[PDB]
Design a protein around this ligand. Structure first.
Ligand SMILES: [Ca+2]
Ligand SMILES: [Ca+2]
Ligand SMILES: [Ca+2]
Ligand SMILES: [Ca+2]
Ligand SMILES: [Ca+2]
Lengths: 8, 413
């Protein structure tokens, strides 16, 4: 939860 | 961690410049890469095909299960217009159903930190507001509150509450603010602090914690105190008592097997008898090996089968065969194996039955078991003592300290 979130 | 049935999904690049996806996770966090957000555009295309929480198992036939975060984003970035995903839904493991403290649903860490800041800075300190909030939040939510409080005030929350709160209430609130591993680690350090040892507290934590819990405790202990927990146990304990505690603290007990080994249950029962009541003296290493290495469901059946060979049950046998700290350790361990909720119910009763209160044991159990098995503890307590745990806390404690403990209890029975 709320981890590093890369958006592609 | 429940992995759903595997599924294939085709996603198409959008003219906005991407797939409309957001992902978290990777092999570095030892959990697979998961879908965290699906865009407004892609959701209309993928209605019923892809979901938030889906783990990405394959990309265009490439296995990305054991790949780290950036490795997956590079594949999707260096991909084409269409991409084929092999996915599986990850239903996160649920918590206990038998805890008294649940997670607040409409949780706002910013609003909680603000309300706590207001209560702390109210003339005289509004303890009731502080207790009401922190006892109706899960431990993980309190961690979010502490992070938000520090950003809002430039002051650590636990530091602020140490000056705003006093007495046993402070001990409860500061205890609730630590993670489970931090709380146990710091309680263990306290039991070995300075000369002498609070063996009862060391015994209580080491005998009662599971493999996973002891694993996290051993890690967090070394981070906090820059020494291994095993080394402090060795320096504060001696003889066979030390060996038992060292063995348990490793948290390498056999995990629950799928099949019941009736032949091994019988052989372990005889070896326990042959090592103790049946002979003069005791083969303590045999007792330690069987009671620290076998799984808990197994030892439960071993202790019943033991009664077929021995005139005394395992607990009475321990009392007759060993003495002192070694005896106390074995007695606690067997209770934790046989019925851990009943074990804690009895320790709660012991801390309140007589003159005054052993607040150290009362606070530790109400904090550490609030999200584990407090509902079972309450059930065993009311069954054995005829009155509720709630009732006993009322008669032994007062003030905001009392209200805090009653909240961790969860209600009357
Ligand atoms: Ca006040
Ligand atoms: Ca104080
Ligand atoms: Ca010591
Ligand atoms: Ca004997
Ligand atoms: Ca009392």
């Amino acid at each position: 939860r709320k981890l590093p979130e890369t958006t592609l | 961690s429940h992995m759903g049935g595997e599924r294939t999904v085709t996603i198409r690049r959008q003219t906005v410049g991407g797939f409309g996806l957001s992902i978290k996770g990777g092999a570095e966090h030892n959990i697979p890469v998961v879908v965290s957000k699906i865009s407004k555009e892609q959701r209309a295309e993928l209605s019923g095909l892809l979901f938030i929480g889906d783990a990405i198992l394959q990309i265009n036939g490439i296995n990305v299960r054991k790949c780290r975060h950036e490795e997956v984003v590079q594949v999707l970035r260096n991909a084409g217009e269409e991409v084929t995903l092999t996915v599986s839904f990850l239903k996160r493991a649920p918590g206990s159903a038998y805890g008294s403290v649940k997670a607040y649903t409409n949780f706002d860490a910013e609003r909680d930190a603000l309300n706590i800041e207001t209560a702390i800075k109210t003339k005289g300190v509004d303890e009731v507001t502080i207790v009401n909030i922190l006892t109706n939040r899960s431990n993980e939510q309190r961690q979010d509150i502490a992070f938000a409080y520090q950003r809002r005030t430039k002051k650590e929350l636990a530091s602020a509450l140490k000056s705003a709160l006093s007495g046993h209430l402070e001990t409860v609130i500061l205890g609730l603010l630590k993670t489970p591993a931090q709380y146990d680690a710091s309680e263990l350090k306290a039991s070995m602090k300075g000369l002498g040892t609070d063996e009862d507290s060391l015994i209580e934590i080491i005998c009662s914690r599971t493999n996973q819990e002891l694993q996290e405790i051993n890690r967090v202990y070394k981070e906090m105190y820059k020494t291994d927990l095993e080394k402090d146990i060795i320096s504060d304990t001696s003889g066979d008592f030390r060996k038992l505690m060292v063995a348990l603290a490793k948290g390498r007990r056999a995990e629950d097997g799928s099949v019941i080994d009736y032949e091994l249950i019988d052989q372990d029962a005889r070896d326990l008898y042959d090592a103790g009541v049946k002979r003069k003296g005791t083969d303590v290493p045999k007792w330690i090996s069987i009671m620290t290495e076998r799984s808990v469901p197994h030892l439960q059946k071993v202790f019943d089968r033991y009664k077929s060979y021995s005139p005394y049950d395992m607990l009475e046998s321990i009392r007759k065969e060993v003495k002192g700290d070694l005896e106390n350790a074995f007695l606690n361990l067997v209770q934790c194996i046989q019925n851990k909720p009943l074990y804690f119910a009895d320790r709660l009763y012991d801390s309140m039955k007589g003159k005054g209160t052993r607040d150290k044991v009362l606070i530790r159990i109400m904090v550490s078991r609030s999200e584990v098995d407090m509902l079972k503890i309450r059930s065993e307590f009311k069954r054995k003592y005829g009155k509720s745990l709630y009732y006993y806390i009322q008669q032994d404690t007062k003030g905001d300290y009392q209200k805090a403990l009653l909240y961790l209890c969860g209600g009357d029975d």
